[PDB]
Structures are given as structure tokens and as C-alpha cells.
Amino acid sequence: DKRNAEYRLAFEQLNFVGADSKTPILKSFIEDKGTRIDEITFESMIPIETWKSYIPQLQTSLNISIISIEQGASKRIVIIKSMAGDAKIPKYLPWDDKYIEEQEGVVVVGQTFSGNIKIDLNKSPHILSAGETGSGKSVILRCILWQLLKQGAIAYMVDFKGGVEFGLEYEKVGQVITEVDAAEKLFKYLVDENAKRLKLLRESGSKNIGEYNKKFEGEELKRIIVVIDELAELMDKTGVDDETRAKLVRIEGYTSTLARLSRATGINLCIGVQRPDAKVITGQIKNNVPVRICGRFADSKASEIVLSNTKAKDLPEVKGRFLFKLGADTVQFQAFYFDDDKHFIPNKILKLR
């Protein structure tokens, strides 16, 4: 076997042997095909602290990037989490307007092993982006927003922290909703706008708003993008009073209806979540929000709430490194770093008269 012959030679060149004079024994090599992260298990008498001292050398000899080395069941077992030197993705990928797609409704979120990650909002209409504060979870949503604003979409932005996440420059290109009263008015409007669009599709025999628009020269329905900076501000009802709770229940009813029924109507939800919790990322959100973007979470439960697998615990500690899940596959990718100070140019959008 190639791998066993390759490891043996590598260990012998280092005289990397235990008290019994044996080089480490390969017990198992488990590759994750989507993330390209491997679990290599070795048996030897070499202490874990010695393996850790050898990390720089083992990376070079075996041609791998070592994420971690941990002791297994016994002091004879080491488990290495690694990525092959061939599984290359950037560690920094600045946004650039050259990535903007010609096809309306198609957005790019970053780079994977073979090509870029593209999302066609006409096929997978809603996105949930989850990550710890500073991960880049929110940066991705603003990058998607910019792309859609450049394709002529209408935007609505929700931020209950006084709108500090969507400053005055965002207000030039759309409406910023900063409190629960304005959010009830917004979501009741979007649910009615969705109902009016479904009515137009049935009546005209149109599959989507794109087919509808071609039928009427002077009647052009535009894509609507709704960016929710933090889903917990709309879903977490724990400490509010009776009236605010009923208002949030009404809003949740509107969000659920929107997510489930806005597939063909060109109304897209881009949701941010800082702390995954089953009360916030419910079964209704999961059943109707197909795109998941997940940052690193050391906790298994947090990854299962977002992805319904534990792979977010395996990611390397790289800023802007995420998991992408659409359907049954989970892949690792580097997200674009979109910086408002240099990438968000409101006058370019306003010029699209």
C-alpha cells in the first residue's frame, strides 16, 4: 500500500521511533470528501508532546497542514486532523467587483477547492449565515446584498441594535428597520407583496417573476432582498412582555409564510445567526432555508442546529473560513472579505436609475 510505504519512509528518515524502536503504525485514514479534512490515527510509544514538537517537520515530510494532534483512547494512540497540501484554498480573499455575475439572481460567496461557490437565488431562495462574532458571518450577507443591489434589487435591512450594523450609507440604497414596530409593518407588507406576486404568477401562467416580466413591457417586478442581521432579535422571545411576545409571534408567522412560499416570487431572505439555538433556528426555518453558511463552532450541538451534522467543529482557525451546505453535501470554502469602507459605494447603485 502506497500510504503505509510513504508514512514508513517519512518516519524512518526522521528516526521517529518509540522505546520499542518502532515507527508509528497507521490504524486508520478517514477522509471527509466535502471538507477535505482527514483524520489520521497512529499507534506508537512516542509521547503526544514529542508529536507536537514534530508538527512543523511532519507537515513537510507528509505534505499536510496539521489542524490538531490529540491523544486517543490510550497514551499509545494519536489522532491528527489535517488537510493535504493539494487541498488548497486561500486564507484571505478580498472582494472584487469582477466576481459580480451577469445572470440576475446569481451570487458568489467565495472560493472552494475547484472553483467558486455560486448561489442561484431562483433555485435556492434563502440563506442562513451562522458564526461567532468577528467570524465574517455578517460580512458574507453584506457581500450578497452588494451583488443584488448591483443587479437592481430592492433592499430591506433589519437591525434592532439601533441600525448601527446598517449605517447611513445603507439608508441611501434601501430601508433600514431598527425596531419591532417597523419590523411588524415590514413583514406584513412583504407577506402581502408575496401574495400579490403568487396571484400574478397563477393568473399569467408564469413559473416565476422573470417569466411574468417578459409578458408585460411596463410592469417589471423587481427582486426584493431582506437582510436580517440577527435572527435572535425576531425569534428569541424569552424575556419580553406579553404584547411584545404576541408581536414577535405575528412576525414569526410572517417570516415562516415568506420562507415557505417565496420560491418563485423573487423575495429573498438573508439571515445572520450569532448563537445557534433550536428556539431561533427552528424546524420551520430549517425546512425552508436551503443554503447554510456555517463558521467554526467547537460545540457539536451548535453545528447540528445549523447543518444537521457536527462538521463545524473540524474547521481550521482561519478568519473567513466556512462550511457551505446546500442539499446533502457540506463543503469547505473561503468567504470573500467585503469591507464597507472600501467596497460599499452607494453612488454606483443610485446611478442604476
Ligand X SMILES: OC[C@H]1O[C@@H](O)[C@H](O)[C@@H](O)[C@@H]1O
By CB under 6 A, residue 258 contacts ligand X: no
28 is in an annotated binding site: no
Per-residue cell: 351: 446611478
300 is in an annotated binding site: no
Per-residue cell: 105: 439572481
134 is in an annotated binding site: yes
Distance in Å, CB of 324 to ligand X, minimum: 6
291 is in an annotated binding site: no
Distance in Å, CB of 296 to ligand X, minimum: 13
Distance in Å, CB of 157 to ligand X, minimum: 11
* DSSP secondary structure string for all residues of 125-153: --EEEE--TTSSHHHHHHHHHHHHHHTT-
By CB under 6 A, residue 311 contacts ligand X: yes
By CB under 6 A, residue 39 contacts ligand X: yes
Q: What share of the chain is helix, strand, coil (3-state, %, to 5)?
A: 35, 25, 40
Site string for ligand X, 176-215 (x = CB under 6 A): ---------xx--x--------------------------
Contacts of 89 (CB under 8 A, 6+ apart): 111, 112, 113, 321, 332, 333, 334
Interatomic CA distance for residues 347 and 31, integer angstroms: 48
Strand order in the sheet with 38-43: 25-31, 38-43, 77-84, 64-71
335 is in an annotated binding site: yes
Distance in Å, CB of 274 to ligand X, minimum: 23
By CB under 6 A, residue 101 contacts ligand X: no
For every residue of 186-244, which 3-state class applies, written as one string? HHHHHHHHHHHHHHHHHHHCCCCHHHHHHHCCCCCCCCEEEEECCCHHHHCCCCCCHHH
Selected binder of ligand X within 159, 165, 233, 314 (CB under 6 A): 314
Per-residue cell: 226: 431582506
Cβ-based nearer residue to ligand X, 83 or 209:
83
313 is in an annotated binding site: no
Selected binder of ligand X within 59, 112, 208, 213 (CB under 6 A): 112
Are 232 and 251 in contact, with CB atoms under 8 Å apart?
no
β-strand pairing of 224-228 with 154-158: parallel
Selected binder of ligand X within 80, 226, 228, 331 (CB under 6 A): 331
By CB under 6 A, residue 38 contacts ligand X: yes
Which range touches ligand X (CB under 6 A), out of 6-14, 37-45, 55-63, 337-345? Answer: 37-45
Interatomic CA distance for residues 159 and 179, integer angstroms: 8
Annotated binding site for ATP: 131-139, 335
Binding residues for ligand X, per CB under 6 A?
30, 32, 37-39, 112, 115, 117-118, 175, 185-186, 189, 310-311, 314, 324, 326, 331
Annotated binding site: 131-139, 335
